[PDB]
Enzyme design. Sequence first.
Site, short mmCIF file in Angstrom:
data_model
loop_
_atom_site.label_atom_id
_atom_site.label_comp_id
_atom_site.label_asym_id
_atom_site.label_seq_id
_atom_site.Cartn_x
_atom_site.Cartn_y
_atom_site.Cartn_z
N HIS A 35 -4.90 -13.16 45.40
CA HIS A 35 -3.67 -13.77 45.89
C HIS A 35 -3.46 -13.51 47.37
O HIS A 35 -3.21 -14.44 48.14
CB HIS A 35 -2.47 -13.25 45.11
CG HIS A 35 -1.19 -13.79 45.64
ND1 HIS A 35 -0.68 -15.00 45.23
CD2 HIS A 35 -0.39 -13.36 46.64
CE1 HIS A 35 0.43 -15.25 45.90
NE2 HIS A 35 0.62 -14.28 46.77
N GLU A 129 5.46 -8.18 52.91
CA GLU A 129 5.24 -9.18 51.85
C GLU A 129 5.59 -8.60 50.47
O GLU A 129 5.33 -7.48 50.19
CB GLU A 129 3.79 -9.71 51.88
CG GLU A 129 3.42 -10.30 53.25
CD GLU A 129 2.02 -10.87 53.31
OE1 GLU A 129 1.50 -11.26 52.25
OE2 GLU A 129 1.48 -10.88 54.42
N1 LIG Z 1 5.47 -18.65 51.46
C1 LIG Z 1 5.89 -17.60 52.11
O1 LIG Z 1 6.93 -17.52 52.64
C2 LIG Z 1 4.96 -16.42 52.11
C3 LIG Z 1 5.49 -15.15 52.16
C4 LIG Z 1 4.66 -14.06 52.21
C5 LIG Z 1 3.31 -14.23 52.21
N2 LIG Z 1 2.78 -15.43 52.15
C6 LIG Z 1 1.32 -15.47 52.16
O2 LIG Z 1 0.91 -16.71 52.69
C7 LIG Z 1 -0.20 -17.27 51.99
C8 LIG Z 1 0.23 -18.70 51.61
O3 LIG Z 1 1.26 -18.48 50.68
P1 LIG Z 1 2.21 -19.60 49.97
O4 LIG Z 1 3.35 -18.88 49.32
O5 LIG Z 1 2.61 -20.57 51.01
O6 LIG Z 1 1.15 -20.22 48.88
P2 LIG Z 1 1.58 -21.18 47.66
O7 LIG Z 1 0.21 -21.67 47.08
O8 LIG Z 1 2.49 -20.41 46.71
O9 LIG Z 1 2.40 -22.39 48.27
C9 LIG Z 1 1.85 -23.26 49.19
C10 LIG Z 1 2.41 -24.64 48.89
O10 LIG Z 1 2.00 -25.02 47.61
C11 LIG Z 1 3.03 -25.75 46.91
N3 LIG Z 1 3.26 -25.07 45.62
C12 LIG Z 1 3.28 -23.75 45.44
N4 LIG Z 1 3.37 -23.48 44.18
C13 LIG Z 1 3.44 -24.64 43.52
C14 LIG Z 1 3.51 -25.02 42.13
N5 LIG Z 1 3.60 -24.10 41.19
N6 LIG Z 1 3.53 -26.30 41.87
C15 LIG Z 1 3.47 -27.20 42.85
N7 LIG Z 1 3.36 -26.96 44.14
C16 LIG Z 1 3.35 -25.69 44.50
C17 LIG Z 1 4.15 -25.88 47.85
O11 LIG Z 1 3.93 -27.07 48.57
C18 LIG Z 1 3.92 -24.73 48.77
O12 LIG Z 1 4.54 -24.94 50.00
C19 LIG Z 1 -0.47 -16.34 50.81
O13 LIG Z 1 -1.68 -15.59 51.01
C20 LIG Z 1 0.73 -15.39 50.78
O14 LIG Z 1 0.47 -14.05 50.31
C21 LIG Z 1 3.56 -16.51 52.14
#
Ligand SMILES: NC(=O)c1ccc[n+]([C@@H]2O[C@H](COP(=O)([O-])OP(=O)(O)OC[C@H]3O[C@@H](n4cnc5c(N)ncnc54)[C@H](O)[C@@H]3O)[C@@H](O)[C@H]2O)c1
EC number: 2.4.2.-
Length: 180
Positions: A35, A129
């Site tokens: 992850h 995070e």
């Molecule tokens: N999102 C944040 O604010 C956040 C916070 C901390 C760390 N991160 C880090 O950043 C990296 C990218 O993280 P993320 O949270 O953006 O990844 P993610 O795969 O959870 O989300 C990316 C995109 O995927 C889509 N998505 C997510 N889950 C979905 C589902 N169940 N069904 C349909 N669409 C869905 C959305 O468009 C989302 O913007 C990771 O390695 C993570 O640890 C992100």
Amino acid sequence: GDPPATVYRYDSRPPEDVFQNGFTAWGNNDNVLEHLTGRSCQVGSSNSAFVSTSSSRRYTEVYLEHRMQEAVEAERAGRGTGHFIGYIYEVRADNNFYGAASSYFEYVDTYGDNAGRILAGALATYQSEYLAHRRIPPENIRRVTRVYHNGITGETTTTEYSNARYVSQQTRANPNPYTS
Ligand SMILES: NC(=O)c1ccc[n+]([C@@H]2O[C@H](COP(=O)([O-])OP(=O)(O)OC[C@H]3O[C@@H](n4cnc5c(N)ncnc54)[C@H](O)[C@@H]3O)[C@@H](O)[C@H]2O)c1
């Protein structure tokens, strides 16, 4: 020094979905290392059991601003339209939210090889995070900031919305690392 009660999540999906439905993880893959390196998220295998959040609002702002700038770069290169809509959700954390750094170290100390395991400072190692396991229920989602960038005129507009389904209760993130 207590675990945070409030975390933030950048997401492309709008509150008509998220405020009613919450966030659901992609799947059942609870491997913490896969992850945090992104391998189980959308650009990888799209099966992570974790919904990513940060206790640093600034982290999610950098994320939104980067996605917005990447949109704008796509037009200076001629393969895009300019427009961008992003969301930053403010979320109450509870015992299903686990520190990423603590969970990472727990994983690699037990199952890892050498890489990034001994030389791994606090700022470098997924700092602020937090990983929500399986779900962030809609009752935990307090509000959202929408940022809209008009790529034709250049105008950016920021608005806020409150979730009527939010339940205010006394919870904070789990003090312990995640374990399977
Ligand atoms: N999102 C944040 O604010 C956040 C916070 C901390 C760390 N991160 C880090 O950043 C990296 C990218 O993280 P993320 O949270 O953006 O990844 P993610 O795969 O959870 O989300 C990316 C995109 O995927 C889509 N998505 C997510 N889950 C979905 C589902 N169940 N069904 C349909 N669409 C869905 C959305 O468009 C989302 O913007 C990771 O390695 C993570 O640890 C992100």
